[PDB]
Design a protein around this ligand. Sequence first.
Ligand SMILES: [Mg+2]
Ligand SMILES: [Mg+2]
Ligand SMILES: [Mg+2]
Ligand SMILES: [Mg+2]
Ligand SMILES: [Mg+2]
Ligand SMILES: [Mg+2]
Ligand SMILES: [Mg+2]
Lengths: 396, 421, 174, 169
Amino acid sequence: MNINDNLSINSPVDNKNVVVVRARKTDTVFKAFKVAPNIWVAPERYYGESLSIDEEYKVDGGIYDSNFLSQDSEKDKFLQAIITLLKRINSTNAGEKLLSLISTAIPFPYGYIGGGYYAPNMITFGSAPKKKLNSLISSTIPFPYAGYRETNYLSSEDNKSFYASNIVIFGPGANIVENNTVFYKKEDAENGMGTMTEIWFQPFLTYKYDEFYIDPAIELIKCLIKSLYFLYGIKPSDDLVIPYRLRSELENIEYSQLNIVDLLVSGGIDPKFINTDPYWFTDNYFSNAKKVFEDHRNIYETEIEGNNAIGNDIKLRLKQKFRININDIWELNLNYFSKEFSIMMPDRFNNALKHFYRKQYYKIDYPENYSINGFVNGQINAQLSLSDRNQDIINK
Amino acid sequence: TQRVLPYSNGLYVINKGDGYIRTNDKDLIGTLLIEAGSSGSIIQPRLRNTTRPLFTTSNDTKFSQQYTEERLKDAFNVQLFNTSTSLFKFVEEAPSDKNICIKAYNTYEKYELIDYQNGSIVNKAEYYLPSLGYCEVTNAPSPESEVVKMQVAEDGFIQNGPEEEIVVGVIDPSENIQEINTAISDNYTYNIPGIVNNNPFYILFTVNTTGIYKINAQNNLPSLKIYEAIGSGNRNFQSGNLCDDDIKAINYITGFDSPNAKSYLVVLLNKDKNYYIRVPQTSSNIENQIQFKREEGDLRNLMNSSVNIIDNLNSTGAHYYTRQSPDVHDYISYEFTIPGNFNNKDTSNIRLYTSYNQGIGTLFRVTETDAGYNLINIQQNLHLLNNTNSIRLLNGAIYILKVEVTELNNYNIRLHIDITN
Amino acid sequence: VINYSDTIDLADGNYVVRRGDGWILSRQNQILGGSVISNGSTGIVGDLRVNDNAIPYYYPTPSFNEEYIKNNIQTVFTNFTEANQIPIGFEFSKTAPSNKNLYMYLQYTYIRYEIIKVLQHEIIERAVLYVPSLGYVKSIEFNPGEKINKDFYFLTNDKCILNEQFLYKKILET
Amino acid sequence: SDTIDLADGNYVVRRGDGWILSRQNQILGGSVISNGSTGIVGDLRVNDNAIPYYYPTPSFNEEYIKNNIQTVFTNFTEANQIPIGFEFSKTAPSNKNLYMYLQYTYIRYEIIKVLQHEIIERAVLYVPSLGYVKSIEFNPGEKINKDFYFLTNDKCILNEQFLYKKILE
Ligand SMILES: [Mg+2]
Ligand SMILES: [Mg+2]
Ligand SMILES: [Mg+2]
Ligand SMILES: [Mg+2]
Ligand SMILES: [Mg+2]
Ligand SMILES: [Mg+2]
Ligand SMILES: [Mg+2]
């Protein structure tokens, strides 16, 4: 499908595409816009992180601004930038398939309140008056008809309205040059059920690496690919990490390490040393996640399928969700989209760039500096201005 | 041939009946062909609560969907627009001789939000609230009959339910409301605050003593209007204090809209009910006070009505005064002074009549007696519509005419004073 | 012209009162919708709610807040907060007569609970609580263009379609 | 049908309710009740059984038909997600057996092209509205008419409609 276009920061709240919903269970509330089915954009800073932190807690290479994305003009620019990036992603067959998969990869809903996925309880309604006394002549309907309790939804401020949601694209947190991908519920993120995924994204700043600027669309795509692990509930144990770079600068032997998801998503040359045709690196996670994915697939195939007290909006999406295999998610990375979109990206140690060279940030404007066709005049000859925030970078 | 609406200036929500369907079978749930001896059931079991309300407006920037929904919430306290858990099922048993068709349509309830001003609707919105269905039964069409080609009809609505028109005035949300938390004693003076800078506004108040009150402004300017909060005081209550139930549904009692008309209100108030008083936009920076006074004398005969003060009756000849006519069986009063010096013997010939509206008038005379303010009933059952009878009244004397509208034939009522001699 | 008198022949204190079943509210008559049946058809309206709870209408006072009202009503009377979780349902069936149209509309019925403060044989303060009980329908057989009584559609003030009750208990801090 | 009294162009036409398809009569199943009992057969229009059937033409593809029909007539994409039930009840006489079979009814929409007041192209959409049952009392070994079971061509059990609107360019 195509991303919704008729959205503005001042667009009225209609409870269909423009909603004002609570952030998790806190007393904080934010405005969200539906761009695609089960896909939302919240053009504000991320609520979960304090926008002003200690000087000791500021990370190296980061930029901190508590007043960024506070005005409504900045919010509208952010919303339009995210819409443009999503349109560019959806303008290619591969990116369109990725967005459709995200839209259909709803987290597995919990069963009936009493526990179970099998069947409703039924109930009788109606009567024909009379001679005959037509008391048992009546209609029979399944009682709940929707008892499955979905975990992917944003709750309105009054806590009386609920809107389906798989992906919410927020602004940056404390650090405005740090994109991130976080999960709604860790338990649901690791048990195969899946959970809603939130994204912190910065579309206004890029950095020049070896004569070309990083395309924000492919950064968003990295976040979207990482969201598949959370949507499918196949987030590994936090301890599953691989050695990424030997810290030869230090006097003693020390290894930098990386989470397996970041390695398998970021792409480049590094993951080819871990993903081999004969596997040389294995863990309980791969077999266990395959097992739990098969378990949820069986739950659908045996119980959810043969249950016509469900709307198609849930079971058809589950059907399309289980059309994919786990190995498909594992093999999916950024190199595929680099080829499909013809987008240049760092290829060696792309997650350790903060060590090898000092990033300088350039301001991206939409649609003058970036259109649906990517950067105007490409990633090489783009006319970008050095951002005013290069002086605010933390040097530790 | 336009019917007269005697409503006062303001915002109204009208329930215009149930059982509304769209043309061209847009709302057709479907048709059941029931064989002889069989039964047919069509159920809306609300397995999904979602409903599809409809909305049209004459202006979307003022009477928007949000605004219309809020006005509906004010009028009838409706709170579910998109959802509904209410089921409805239709059962039809075909008789043993012939077959029966049943056609089931989704229905709507037609609420109409109007902005009534000077006897003409200046803004109007239609909200169709999802209702509980319509079912029509018909004889089975004989196979095969014959088909007649037809063009699709224009987009519209057809009512299949009973005739219904429930008009409920609502509080204008652009006008601030001031609340008098403590009850009204027999005499009170409300100082109009400076915050409401000569903008029209409401005063919400309760009364301590059930009785007839004269309410006015300084020099009876501007005219005031009074409403009753519908269904107020059937709930939470504290003695002597105004327990406000957020009731924006208002019932018009009396009052003039023309802010240049001298008038004072004589209205019966209950100590259990809550009342709104609207004071219109004043074109001046004038500090004003709302005077409430419980009436014990003969002025109790003027309830419920606005009394219109006539000033320019300072010469002989023909005069006439046009004011917003009340509904049928409602009242309007006129207090006027006969021209000339008063010596209790000089008299002039007076003729009272109306031009279009028929009404029954009672004429009181103002005299000071041992008791004080005192009304003497001097004329009863005067039929004002083109009345031909005249009476001699004392020059320099004050008279109060109370007119009860018996036939509504125009939005305005025109009362004439014809003075000979 | 008609007066509600707030004196009661009870001792001085605070009292929880159940006023009975079958209370309908003002202006909320037709806010649920109506069905129009015709010529020998049977219309059945109802409401079954898997959805745990319908919202209760609080009308509290300075002395009696929602915590006070809810705690006392549930302590003495039905534990409505949890009892609203269990399902509930009802139905009404009417038959339209031949060659005549019938209209029916449904409205919720409520249990009216009160918290009264009695002082010197007179109630000086009263808080009200409506808990949704069930439904109630009103019908009429009508002809095209037939004028209908305004009281059939609209209700000016709250009433009880059944006999009112006064089941009291004096509230004592324990 | 040929040579209508319409100007040249494309038209959306509603043919009415109560259309049953050919050869599809007893594909839903049947019930056999006997000796004073009452049989109730019904269905719930939700999801897959509510999916409409398309029959396009070179000028009128699926999207053209769907969008034009929904613009003019009832929006069946939104309305088919809300479940709607129907039922039929019949009572068997004493000491006798009765058979009853159910088949869906459809709303028949047409997209027609008129050139010089003669229809040259017609595409058809069937939207599943509701059902319809047929019953007969039978004796052991009794022959049953072939019309009760089988239907040769698509027909309307009610009076056919013809509600046309010209599709604007
Ligand atoms: Mg119309
Ligand atoms: Mg007093
Ligand atoms: Mg008295
Ligand atoms: Mg004037
Ligand atoms: Mg005039
Ligand atoms: Mg009882
Ligand atoms: Mg529609």
